[PDB]
């Protein structure tokens, strides 16, 4: 009955300080705790910090130097601050509701406890990355139907030229299609940018006219792009 | 550091050691996580899973000391596959701020699917801004692992090819692309343009050609 | 009319005396573990029935105070401990400086110590460096790493206790010889000295458990009907007051940590047994007593304590104000490892105008030792392997007053533990020695048969 929603950036410069947003739906964020965990590529997941519900912090001692973790009570969202960012910062960045237990094995009044953290609730996770290059908005050609197998079956496409950086958003009529759909993952390329395609299976006897439209979005770009596909 | 590997038959159950093992009394939390989603934590407190979990998985109770942590699944299917980590909280141990070691968890024994490869020439519009991309797709195959060469003609290009690693899908089949970079003059030249994708010893070839 | 002395062979006359009693023990054969220090190699087996013999009108005076069986039994207990000690393996090479860093813990707590040290191994030329775990008590600082001392090298040498030997109390019956006899009082309200209307005569006294303790004392005897209250002179601050339970009080103190024992060989021969590394969570040993149970035997003690201090009058009680730790903590031995508690919750209380909730009191633990005042050798506890609970029966307390204050405003009540012999009063207080004297004579009107 809790939604998490991770917003940023995506993109920052190298050496300069970057900041996160995390919006909870379901519940006050002054009841439970909140934590942040990140997931770099070829490395297991970090957790790097977590904040309480009376407004505590606690941080991961090897990143401890350079991160600031905040709240805030007119919104149901918690802030995550880091500076002096480099190449290795970049990943993809999770935050969660944590819950805290206690575990006794002996008796209460001599100490004999100790507190653990478990994060039940997850958002779905935004991506980062941390790279000098600027900025390079996608260009869409599609992908015309070959006219494929013998029917009902034929496919068509669009292709995302390439583009910085990840990711890419691609939705077909606004939505309106979801069966036969896949969009398969983006290509680096020795150009240092990415490149994605996307295809639908649909019958030879839809054509024709379906007006079949692809619709793409790139979050840095600030350009959304919508292209027509026909034979 | 890096992931340790483990592989089960289909449909048999599976235990999963965890590294660290504990000093002390411990509380161990189990964490399912698939590359580029969000992880599922699948039991909390060693006994105890939350809700919409399956009964499948389960942790052992440090009821007397001496036993050792472990993931038991049963029923093991595609799904299933995936990384685990090992949350250690012992009493002797301070505060335990990393994860465990990653365990790669392969199921073996799947059925292999014959990969769906549509290869896609240059829109005329591409054409029109001096550039030309060949695009050959490769979809629901398994196990992930497949060689991409490209052929003008008889001749292989060799160059300006860029090919993904294989990914999963919700399909829990793989899934990868390959992108041909030409001048569009080179593709007016040649009579036809190839793709072959090589997948365990099978070999599977598509053809296109200019208008 | 005519009067003549006559001799009388065996009369019942006794005359106060002090002699050498010996020991009695019911012989258990023990093949699997043996040689507790008090019944030794052996100790003279007890009679399969005893015989008390009830003395009809006979009113004898008894002084628990001035008694020599006390003084005894305190010379053989000591000497028994140095006897017991002497074949065991002496720790003159221990005394190497310890580089000791403290047992892993999230550091929210930590007493005990992991202590690297050099030991000389068989061989005289080679040497080990071994590591053992001693609790903060043994050890003391003197400069780095951290380096560290035992606590005793620089007061005496140190030996190590055979593990063979138990410290668990056994019932020791003390018998006179014969030509002597032992009176035996049983006056249930009886006060520790006076005329005891009630008095029979035994061979040997009942098992006596020699349990070493401070503060409470531990399995002795209770006194039947009202608890009794027993000094040398009440109004006396500076003489201890002795206090026997009715009923029972139960204390189970438990040492949780799941030791280990490690056997290094530090010559021919010899080996020290130092702690290894402990198994599972580090918790610290203590004892719980039931509040209930407790809180009315405190009452009890005050009804008979305002006995001999007004009807109404303020009765406090404080925890103990003096000394060094080893007189000011509930000191005991429970399977070989000896406790030190504090007892402050035990006396805090005050008294005027006449859930489980069981009381838990923490206690610490030392290996090395010196039990009576003994300056000069001390012992060395071999580590007890796994965890340690036993349950023991509280009957008796020992108390001292505050002294020097304004009369019978207020009264307050401080545990003391000033001598080891007020234990043994507290069993011996109703036995006494006497020797027969069986020549009697007397004048009857008996002639012997004429000479001439
Ligand atoms: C002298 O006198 C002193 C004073 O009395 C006395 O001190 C006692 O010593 C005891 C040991 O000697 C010591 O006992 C242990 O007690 C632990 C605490 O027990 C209480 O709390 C727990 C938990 O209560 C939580 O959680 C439950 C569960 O959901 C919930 O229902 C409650 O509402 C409560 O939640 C609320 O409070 C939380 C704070 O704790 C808070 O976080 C929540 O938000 C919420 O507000 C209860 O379950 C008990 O009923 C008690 O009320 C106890 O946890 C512990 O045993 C466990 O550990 C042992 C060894 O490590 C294991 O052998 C044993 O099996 C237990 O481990 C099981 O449970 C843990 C955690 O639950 C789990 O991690 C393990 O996997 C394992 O699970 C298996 O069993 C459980 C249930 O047993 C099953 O559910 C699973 O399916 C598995 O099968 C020990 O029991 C005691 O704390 C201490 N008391 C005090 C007050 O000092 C001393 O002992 C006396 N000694 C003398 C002289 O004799
Ligand atoms: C006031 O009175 C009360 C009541 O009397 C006192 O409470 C007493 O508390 C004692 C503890 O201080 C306790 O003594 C011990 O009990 C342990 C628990 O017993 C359990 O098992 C028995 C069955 O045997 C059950 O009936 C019982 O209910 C319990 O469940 C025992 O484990 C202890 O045994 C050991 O220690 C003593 C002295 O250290 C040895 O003489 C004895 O042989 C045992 O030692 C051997 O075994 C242990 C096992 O790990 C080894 O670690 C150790 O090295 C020994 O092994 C060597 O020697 C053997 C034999 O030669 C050999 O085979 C082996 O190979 C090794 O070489 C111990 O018995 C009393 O039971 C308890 N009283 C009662 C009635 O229960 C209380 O302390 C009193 N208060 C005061 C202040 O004194
Ligand atoms: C401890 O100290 C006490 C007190 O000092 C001693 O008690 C005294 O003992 C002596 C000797 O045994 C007693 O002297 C004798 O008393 C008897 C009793 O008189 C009879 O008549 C009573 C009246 O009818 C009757 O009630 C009595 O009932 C009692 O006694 C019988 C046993 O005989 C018993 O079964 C009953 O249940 C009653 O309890 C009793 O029948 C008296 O008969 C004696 O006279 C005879 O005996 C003497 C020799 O002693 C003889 O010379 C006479 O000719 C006659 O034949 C005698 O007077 C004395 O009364 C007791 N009480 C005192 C002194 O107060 C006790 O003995 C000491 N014990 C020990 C172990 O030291
Ligand atoms: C008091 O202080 C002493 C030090 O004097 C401590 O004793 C040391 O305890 C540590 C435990 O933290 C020991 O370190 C461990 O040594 C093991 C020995 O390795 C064996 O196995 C390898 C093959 O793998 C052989 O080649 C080798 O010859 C040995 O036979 C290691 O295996 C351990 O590694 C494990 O822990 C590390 C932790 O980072 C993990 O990364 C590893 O993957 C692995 O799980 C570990 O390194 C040390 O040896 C002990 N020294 C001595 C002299 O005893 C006491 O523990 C301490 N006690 C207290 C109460 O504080
Ligand atoms: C304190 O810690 C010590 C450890 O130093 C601990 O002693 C150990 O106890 C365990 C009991 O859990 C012992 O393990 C047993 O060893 C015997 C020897 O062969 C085995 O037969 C036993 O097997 C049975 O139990 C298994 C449990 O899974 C069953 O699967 C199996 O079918 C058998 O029924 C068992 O493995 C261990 O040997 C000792 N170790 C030592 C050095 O003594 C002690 O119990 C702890 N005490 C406390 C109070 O915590
Ligand atoms: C072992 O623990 C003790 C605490 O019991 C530590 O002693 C403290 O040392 C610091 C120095 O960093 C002092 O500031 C504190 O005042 C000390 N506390 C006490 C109570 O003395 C000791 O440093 C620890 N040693 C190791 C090696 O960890
Ligand atoms: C033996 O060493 C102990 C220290 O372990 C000394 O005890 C100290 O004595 C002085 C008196 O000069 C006191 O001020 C300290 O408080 C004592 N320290 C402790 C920890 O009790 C003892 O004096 C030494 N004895 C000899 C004869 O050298
Ligand atoms: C135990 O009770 C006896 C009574 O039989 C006390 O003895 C008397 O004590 C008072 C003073 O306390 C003296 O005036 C009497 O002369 C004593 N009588 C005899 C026969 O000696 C004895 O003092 C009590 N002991 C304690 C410690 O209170
Ligand atoms: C000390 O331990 C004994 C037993 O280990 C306790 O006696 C138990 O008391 C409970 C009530 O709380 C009963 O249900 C059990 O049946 C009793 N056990 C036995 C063997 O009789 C005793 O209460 C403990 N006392 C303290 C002060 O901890
Ligand atoms: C025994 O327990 C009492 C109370 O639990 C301890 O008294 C405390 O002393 C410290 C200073 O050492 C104070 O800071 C606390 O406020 C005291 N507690 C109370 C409740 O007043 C006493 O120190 C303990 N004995 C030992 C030897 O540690
Ligand atoms: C500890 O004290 C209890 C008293 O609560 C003792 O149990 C009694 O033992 C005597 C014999 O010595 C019996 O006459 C009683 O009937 C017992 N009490 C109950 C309630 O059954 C127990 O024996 C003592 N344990 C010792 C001295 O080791
Ligand atoms: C052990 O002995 C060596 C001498 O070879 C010494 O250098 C070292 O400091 C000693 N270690 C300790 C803990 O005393
Ligand atoms: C009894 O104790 C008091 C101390 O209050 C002392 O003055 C008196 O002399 C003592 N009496 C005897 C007989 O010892
Ligand atoms: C006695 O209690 C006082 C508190 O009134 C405390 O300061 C002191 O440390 C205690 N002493 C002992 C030995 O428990």
């Known amino acids: 009955q809790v939604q998490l929603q991770e917003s940023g950036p995506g993109l920052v410069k190298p050496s300069e300080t970057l900041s996160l947003t995390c919006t909870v739906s379901?519940?006050?964020?002054?009841?439970?705790?909140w934590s942040w965990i990140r997931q770099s590529p070829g490395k297991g997941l970090e957790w790097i910090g977590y904040?309480?519900?009376?407004?505590?912090?606690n941080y991961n001692p090897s990143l401890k130097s350079r991160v600031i973790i905040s709240v805030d009570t007119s919104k149901n969202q918690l802030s995550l601050k880091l500076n002096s960012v480099t190449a290795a910062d970049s990943a993809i960045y999770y935050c969660?509701?944590?819950?805290?237990?206690?575990?006794?094995?002996?008796?209460?009044?001599?100490?004999?406890?100790?507190?653990?953290?478990?994060?039940?609730?997850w958002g779905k996770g935004t991506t980062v990355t941390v790279s000098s290059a600027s900025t390079k908005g996608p260009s869409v050609f599609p992908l015309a139907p070959s006219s494929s197998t013998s029917g009902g079956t034929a496919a068509l496409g669009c292709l995302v030229k390439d583009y910085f950086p990840e990711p890419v958003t691609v939705s077909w009529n606004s939505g309106a299609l979801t069966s036969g759909v896949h969009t398969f993952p983006a290509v680096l390329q020795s150009s240092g940018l990415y490149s994605l395609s996307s295809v639908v299976t649909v019958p030879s006897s839809s054509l024709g006219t379906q007006t079949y439209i692809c619709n793409v979005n790139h979050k840095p770009s600030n350009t959304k792009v919508d292209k027509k596909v026909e034979p | 550091s890096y992931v340790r590997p483990l592989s089960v038959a289909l449909g048999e159950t599976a235990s999963i050691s965890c590294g660290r093992q504990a000093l002390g009394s411990r509380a161990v939390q189990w964490y399912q996580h698939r590359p580029g989603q969000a992880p599922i934590l699948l039991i909390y407190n060693n006994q105890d899973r939350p809700s919409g979990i399956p009964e499948r998985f389960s942790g052992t109770p440090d009821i007397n000391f001496g036993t050792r942590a472990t993931l038991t699944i049963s029923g093991v299917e595609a799904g299933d596959e995936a990384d685990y980590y090992c949350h250690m909280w012992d009493s002797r141990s301070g505060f335990s701020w990393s994860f465990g070691g990653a365990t790669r968890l392969t199921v073996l024994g799947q059925p292999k699917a014959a990969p769906s490869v549509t290869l896609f020439p240059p829109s005329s519009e591409e054409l029109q801004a001096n550039k030309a991309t060949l695009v050959c797709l490769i979809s629901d195959f398994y196990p992930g692992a497949v060689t991409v060469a490209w052929k003008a003609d008889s001749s292989p290009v060799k160059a300006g090819v860029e090919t993904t690693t294989p990914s999963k899908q919700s399909n829990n089949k793989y899934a990868a692309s390959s992108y041909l970079s030409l001048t569009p003059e080179q593709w007016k030249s040649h009579k036809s343009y190839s793709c072959q994708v090589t997948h365990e010893g099978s070999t599977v070839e598509k053809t296109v050609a200019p208008t | 009319e005519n009067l003549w002395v006559t001799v009388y062979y065996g009369v019942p006359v006794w005359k106060d005396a002090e002699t050498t009693l010996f020991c009695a023990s019911d012989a258990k054969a023990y093949e699997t573990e043996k040689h507790n220090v008090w019944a030794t190699h052996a100790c003279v087996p007890t009679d399969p029935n005893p015989q008390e013999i009830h003395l009809e009108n006979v009113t004898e005076e008894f002084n628990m105070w001035k008694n020599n069986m006390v003084e005894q039994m305190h010379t053989d207990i000591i000497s028994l401990w140095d006897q017991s000690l002497k074949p065991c393996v002496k720790l003159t090479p221990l005394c190497v400086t310890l580089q000791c860093t403290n047992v892993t813990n999230a550091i929210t707590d930590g007493e005990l110590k992991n202590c690297s040290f050099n030991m000389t191994t068989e061989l005289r030329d080679k040497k080990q460096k071994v590591y053992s775990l001693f609790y903060r008590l043994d050890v003391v600082q003197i400069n780095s790493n951290k380096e560290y001392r035992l606590i005793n090298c620089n007061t005496s040498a140190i030996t190590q206790a055979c593990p063979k030997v138990s410290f668990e109390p056994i019932p020791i019956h003390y018998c006179a010889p014969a030509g002597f006899a032992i009176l035996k009082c049983k006056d249930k309200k009886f006060n520790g000295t006076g005329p005891c209307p009630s008095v029979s005569t035994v061979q040997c006294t009942h098992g006596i458990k020699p349990v070493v303790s401070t503060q409470l004392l531990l399995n002795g005897s209770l006194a039947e009907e009202e608890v009794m209250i027993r000094s040398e002179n009440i109004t006396n601050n500076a003489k201890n007051i002795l206090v026997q339970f009715n009923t029972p009080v139960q204390i189970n103190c438990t040492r949780p940590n799941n030791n280990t024992r490690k056997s290094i060989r530090i010559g021919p021969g010899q080996a020290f047994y130092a702690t290894g590394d402990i198994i599972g969570d580090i918790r610290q040993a203590h004892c719980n007593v039931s509040k209930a149970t407790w809180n009315e035997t405190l009452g009890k003690v005050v009804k008979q304590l305002r006995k001999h201090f007004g009807n109404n009058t303020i009765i406090r009680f404080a925890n103990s104000s003096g000394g060094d730790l080893e007189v000011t903590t509930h000191s005991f031995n429970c399977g070989g490892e000896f406790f030190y508690c504090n007892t402050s919750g035990l006396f805090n209380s005050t008294w005027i105008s006449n859930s489980n909730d069981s009381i838990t009191l923490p206690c610490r633990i030392k290996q090395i030792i010196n039990m009576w005042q003994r300056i000069g050798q001390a012992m060395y506890a071999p580590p007890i392997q796994g965890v340690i609970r036993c349950v023991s029966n509280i009957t008796g307390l020992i108390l001292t007053r505050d002294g020097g204050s304004t009369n019978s405003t207020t009264e307050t009540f401080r545990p003391g533990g000033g001598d080891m012999r007020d234990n043994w009063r507290s069993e011996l207080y109703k036995y006494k020695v006497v020797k027969i004297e069986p020549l009697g004579v007397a004048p009857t009107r008996c002639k012997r048969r004429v000479v001439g």
């Open positions: 379901g519940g006050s964020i002054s009841n439970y705790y």
């Open positions: 904040i309480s519900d009376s407004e505590s912090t």
């Open positions: 969660a509701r944590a819950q805290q237990g206690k575990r006794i094995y002996g008796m209460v009044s001599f100490g004999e406890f100790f507190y653990y953290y478990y994060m039940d609730v």
